[PDB]
Design a protein around this nucleic acid. Sequence first.
DNA 1: CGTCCAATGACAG
DNA 2: CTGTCATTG
Length: 625
Amino acid sequence: SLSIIDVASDQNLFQTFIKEWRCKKRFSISLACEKIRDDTLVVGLAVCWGGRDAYYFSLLDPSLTLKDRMWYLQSCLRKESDKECSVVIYDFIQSYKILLLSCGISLEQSYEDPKVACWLLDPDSQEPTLHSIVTSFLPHELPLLEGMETSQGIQSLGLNAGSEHSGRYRASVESILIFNSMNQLNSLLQKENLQDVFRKVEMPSQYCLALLELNGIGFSTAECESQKHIMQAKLDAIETQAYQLAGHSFSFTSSDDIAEVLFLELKLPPQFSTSKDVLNKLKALHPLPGLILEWRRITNAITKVVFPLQREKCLNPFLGMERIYPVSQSHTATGRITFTEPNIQNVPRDFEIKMGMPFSISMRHAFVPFPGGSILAADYSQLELRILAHLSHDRRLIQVLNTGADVFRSIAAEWKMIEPESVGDDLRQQAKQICYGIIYGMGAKSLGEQMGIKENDAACYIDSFKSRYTGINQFMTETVKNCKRDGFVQTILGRRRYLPGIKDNNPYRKAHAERQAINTIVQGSAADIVKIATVNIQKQLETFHSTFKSHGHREGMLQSDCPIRGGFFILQLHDELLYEVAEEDVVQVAQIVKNEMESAVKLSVKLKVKVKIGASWGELKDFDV
DNA sequence: CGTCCAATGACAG
DNA sequence: CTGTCATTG
Ligand SMILES: Nc1nc2c(ncn2[C@H]2CC[C@@H](COP(=O)(O)OP(=O)(O)OP(=O)(O)O)O2)c(=O)[nH]1
Ligand SMILES: [Mg+2]
């Protein structure tokens, strides 16, 4: 019927509690909540190391100690030294968010997060939940959980549906279930060789993501509003520039309204459709195909970018700047990582604009460091190419990549017209899109589409690039056959993605899976290099400088009862690693970042890392030896 | 019938 | 509760 334990009886009950507790290696933790949402109100933690029994930690109801219990908890939760044990919570970064921000406890020990492992098994799996995992892993214990009906986040986060069950209850059941289940998961991960990949690689990534997510990133409303008004200027100015030819009662937002002037005064339609075709006209025709380009681009640049940023911004009083907080995600098929409260990965790229008298705007420039600080960005120079260069062992690609200069500029130079340089960015970007497309086996006609040429001609260009590099095609067909013989591919770490569709009869599913093996292997392995580089960087930064960890630990300082120095994790652009650092340590931080990124793992070529540095989100790059 | 890859979101019935 | 289109990587 029932087994749970409130731990308070005078002293001795709690005393033998901590006395057993201190001794144990593997153990489980979960917390719970009530109301008032940041929040400092947390009912209490709960701990279970196994069995039907479960232990609760409050914040019937007796009394001796008050702050004492909290000291005991702190002492218990970290790694005195030389003593190495692991700890599990359903999700991680937000529970750690709570422990650090709400109660001011910085948990530091070895970590295991069951949902991340769940993902490590099946990257294609959708967002595991407590019921999902206790269903799939710990069968015999499950029915109890159905008394609640909440599965999304932890049992604290499930406070509403649990509200009738809420209390020590949710935290305890979550604790014990998570423990037995994670013993099952760890068992399955060791049943493969993923465990090394799990505990010694990706959990640290979850951690680094967490202290990032506590850091946030800095923002400037003055710049945001300045460029806002600039975009308004181009908005209305392009409105009148547009309706200078005719205009008839127009507004751009309605495509049926566009159909008037579009289908009337031009008449070239090869509901009807919108995008691809008008890009096709963007190449050749001057009379306002591209007016729709600049307009629609401005529109996406404002309604889907300026607004959520300028909305969910918060301020860090500890700084005196306002900052915005993304969310750690993972759970990609490749193993790459994303962020959503907003997603600032996709933040728009700088582009030129006309009113000589031109102008240019950067939506992203609105991102600023703290007043004393500066922004350090570490870019990998064509990394995925270096990985593929490594596995195919095509010596030619190696030698081409060990030499030329932003080879995309060279491709554009010989392509749309011959210019040595003065290649515009969205041209370089289109060419990049195109080329990276070719490598993964873009279909001949679509390639002919983005380049603007005829099918069979483009196909002859594809056959041409096969002819240029044979190691690529070798490795390609080889890995296809291997994914047939296995039914999965494997990223360098030994994490493997399961492709069901490779063995399928239907030719589209078979084709999509064909390219999919390729991209999952190369990009997946890329994201693994990036992860290792991150956790390495932060791991050195941790002990190498004694100040403290992240801006959240400040709020931890206030709730625990100053200068600004360090460098702090901000963002990842997937081949880029994004830091803000006080302008003291910038050189030290730079060498450390460069070093750890290149020291991630050694391979057939060196991975050159461009390190850009400077004020805000736009920058200059040089370092000398 | 749909043949670059991986992400995130508004939009529509 | 699905597939498009916009951007980035
Ligand atoms: N398949 C594909 N991959 C892309 C595309 N854009 C970016 N990527 C991948 C390849 C490398 C990684 C970073 O791309 P970048 O835009 O940085 O290109 P890069 O190779 O890094 O050069 P640079 O960073 O100097 O622009 O993301 C694209 O349009 N298609
Ligand atoms: Mg790059």
